[PDB]
Point group: D3
Chain length 247, copies 6
């Protein structure tokens, strides 16, 4: 596991954005072999989308052959409603880049057959093969997306009771990704960061199971490191010193 | 992982029995595709077998196309002896339902080649493919069947020194099941329940490794929850409130 | 997991050597199906190589059809230099047994393309299929070879900054072995032994992840048991009592 | 230590009030030997003052010979200001009972010599000899009054930087009381209750040092027991069952 | 604190007896200045009384000017009943030594005024001044005598609900002794020994508060050391090696 | 307790020296009422003595009416030997200030009656009444002076087996001081600092018992904070920010 210790939310976004750009440019996606990106919404990834957009506008990356899968969506909420995940994603990212509509995958919270919708979502991911990079956030209690603490590590896309319900990818869906990058911002995430980095593996703090994942990265700001031991932060600061230059 | 918090041993048996019945009826087993059930013996599963039998007698389930695999048997003990696992299983379950003899699998503690017997048992399970549901109990120290604490998670059916010896399925045998349901009864199992639900993954408390299993369920009575935090029990009580109605 | 509690470094070497000999003789390797052995260097395995050599000289084993893979090598250091891993392995083992040069695999710290060298090493292992037994040591902080604490459990052979650099097999490389045997000597390894045997699974103490491995063995001397609970040592002493007779 | 597990804030107040009444009536205070009561302010003791007042109005207790000492007061804030501790105490308690003005002791946040004011407060307590019962609340982090975590257990009345400052009795001032009763309400106090009852003595959670006090009582509501083990709460519930009847 | 690690219950008794004898002979008690000894009953101190008696019979000590105070007695049970603490003490100790009746203090479980009886017991101890050495045992949960876990460290002699009731000295009564020596026998006391020696101070395990006592000694047998770290036992074994020679 | 987080050993010495100077100048010692200072030796207090001497040379303090008591001395070692505590104290402190010989107290490691020497040392301290400030260091295992881990908190000056022996003040001797200031330097003291500040009270880490002392201060450098949580250090850094200006 990697822990990228940065100071501000803006630096985290710039670091995360650059990592995504580098993975894409190294993969060199084409129509027949697209780069598959898993994505989150909310306040946490705000600075990352902002950074991704300026990099695209500077000509550093193209999303023409990038396929995305989002983590969740509200049930029964009109897609064009300003508070839907769909609206958030277009407003903060899709409206500003060259990704084609057919490459965008968002759960349809208005699907007639909920169980069928979730099933097809998992099917769509497998049709491509695998998610190359899945970016996410982490709950104050260490949970992922709308998955509950003590969720099975093999859980799949399904409906969850918090609108009244939401569709969310499962922990297994996230773990099947080739690489997982979690954005950690704020002192309210300090206990979750501690559980992920210093604690032992346990299903109550879902984030701790990333210790078993082949390629996991935590990108965090200063306030989120409050519960770590001084030597833990020092260790990652020194090891990652050359990789945070320029952010 | 699911934790079904109930009050009495009788409720646990009724809940466990209904879960087995529902899995069977949803699977709709036939001669060519039987539902494979893993089973334990002893005082712990008593109320569950009792409940399974009345459900069968009420016409709610048929074991005609259910194949069973038991966890253990004593070595050198006459099969028809009243204290054998064979006698226990027939007396408490097989004597009262419509399962055919060819669908019953019990380790032969009188086999001439012990190692061959255990090897064939594993072979029999694979011939069917997989155990759909494996029900078991848990030791005071968190162990499973006759497996020792610190047993390998990939251990297989073998002989164990406690009669003098016994044949027991391994932890790997149990983990390969599609779903694992552990019955937890009594305050003497309180530390084991705590290790399974709140503790971290560790090979000393074998039960804790179910946290890594794709579909694990703990069904417990009130006395067994003594070592859990009040909020842990409250959390599962609320989440499972709708699934324990009627038991 | 097995824990073989012995008194001295010499006993550990004799026990480890005999275990290797027994695995080889039971496997009965041939030119078309060789026994693949993973090996470490340093002060820790000294008594084991010494024991392996006398067993070979007594006619108890032949390495004619044994293929070896070593854990590491220094970068840019002349192969014939007295401090290289190559020199250590020949001087302490290869010079005294009947293993053919083509069966010896050591990382080439002088390869022009470092990344290619490491890639081919992994390729060579897969060409044989799998390492049947990988023997290693453990760092004071629980690390393996030159892998850092918090290394990914799927890490592979690569270059590491400590000469200035070294090539080292990854944790995944080690875990892919059919059986892993770690030699633990000295009170300085007491905290690592404790983490491996009594602690919970966590990526900070890499050795703790052997709890998830299908066949792991820790062979230790008396000074290394300082951090274990008296009952833990008593438990393994009794369980392994019959397997340490004669060492 | 005693732990009185009750359900609601109202029950806690009724239990605490009755305990104070019983201590007073058993002490039988007179002009020459008054019963000395330490008191807190805020939302926590609201139901207790309410209960104390109705008991007084029912003729169950008289405060004619009861001397009180309050925990704190704001600095530079006009005494008659509606938000002062003085205003709170009169409005919620003194306005409704028969305690004489000369028996009321409140820190003067407008004293010209702050250090002298605090010094005299301690002097006043010693002039009476000792506080017979000191009632207080507890911070989310286990602190007492305005004392900081890691405060000396012998700290005394002094000014503290949070108005801008406040005068607060010290931990030593509280511990010198013959009996200490802490009101614990709300899930936000759950970690503090756990530290006080189940944790070990440590200066970071000041409340934990009451374990060393000769006569300490925690009176809590249901939401505050969230972090205790089920068996801990069960133990106190059974032991105190006869003392909570009627509240 | 001292920890005397011995092998058998007999050795513990011989060590404890010799310690008592040495303290007495060094004190050189007279009619005006007697040596005050606190004593327990039950299976635990059996080998110690046996050893004390043979030492007396060998002329190594006289109890002519030794005053004793016992920890408890049953309420309402006839003093001469074979199961009373009185009968146990005479049968195992007083019947065999030269202590005068006026020097023996046992709680009167048949006293008309229970509270008065307990009050006078404390008064009797103070009349002498202090207990020079108090020997006791420890509960499986770390408790002392009939004091409950979480008992106040300043608790005094009082009646306790387990006959139906018993009179028991308090924790404060024990702590006021100049020296406290606790006999620890059996694996069932392993967790209590661990809490006393390696754990932190906390009122739930009363025995842990002896860490704060000026002169505490734990005398234990081998089975009771099961929960200690190997290095902890090694440390005390080496430090006390010269003081256990001859037992 | 106070924790003064500084960066270098030199800053620690300057802070500690100034604190001593301020305590002396506020006390205003005279021939009839001297300021009593407890002192340590070794590498740890080096920068503090250096700072104390320049302050004296600058006219900021006089030791004319300061009485000192040192923690230890070697047994049987010639007082004027260059490695004695006597030589260290004169060479690093007494040779440079105006303290009179009669105000200096050092244990006489060559006294004919060891036990008498230690007894008189304690007597000398009481003759003055109390040590106003005792400065010391801390062992890697949390011990004080030559006191062993698990030493009684009431231990007194006595001989200790490490020359072969040394005379050392006891933990009780240190705790009886009005104020205790411990200098903490180096990463090797990180675990001890953690036990003192964040851990719970326990006799194995003697330094942790300072949590119970009325006025304890830890003055530490940066390397010693390695085992503290980032938020712990942040908390003390902010609280002590105004008291470390100028060092």
């Amino acid at each position: 596991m990697r822990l990228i210790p940065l100071t501000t939310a803006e630096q985290v976004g710039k670091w995360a954005a650059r990592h995504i750009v580098n993975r894409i440019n190294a993969f060199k996606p084409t129509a027949d072999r697209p780069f598959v990106l898993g994505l989150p919404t909310g306040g946490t990834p705000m600075t990352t989308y902002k950074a991704l957009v300026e990099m695209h506008k500077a000509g550093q990356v193209s999303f023409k052959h990038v396929v995305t899968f989002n983590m969740d969506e509200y049930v029964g909420l009109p897609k064009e409603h300003p508070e839907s995940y769909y609206s958030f994603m277009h407003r903060n990212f899709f409206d500003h880049v060259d990704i084609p509509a057919e490459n965008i995958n968002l759960l349809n919270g208005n699907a007639p057959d909920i169980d069928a919708e979730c099933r097809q979502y998992e099917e769509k991911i497998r049709s491509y093969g695998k998610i190359h990079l899945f970016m996410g956030g982490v709950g104050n209690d260490g949970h992922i997306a709308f998955n509950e603490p003590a969720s099975s590590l093999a859980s799949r896309t399904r409906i969850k009771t918090l609108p009244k319900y939401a569709l969310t990818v499962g922990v297994g869906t996230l773990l099947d990704a080739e690489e997982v990058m979690i954005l950690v911002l704020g002192s309210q995430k300090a206990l979750a960061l501690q559980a992920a980095v210093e604690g032992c593996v346990n299903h109550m703090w879902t984030i701790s199971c990333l210790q078993l994942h082949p390629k996991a990265i935590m990108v965090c700001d200063e306030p989120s490191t409050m519960e770590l031991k001084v030597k833990t932060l020092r260790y990652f600061n020194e090891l990652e010193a050359e990789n945070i230059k320029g952010l």
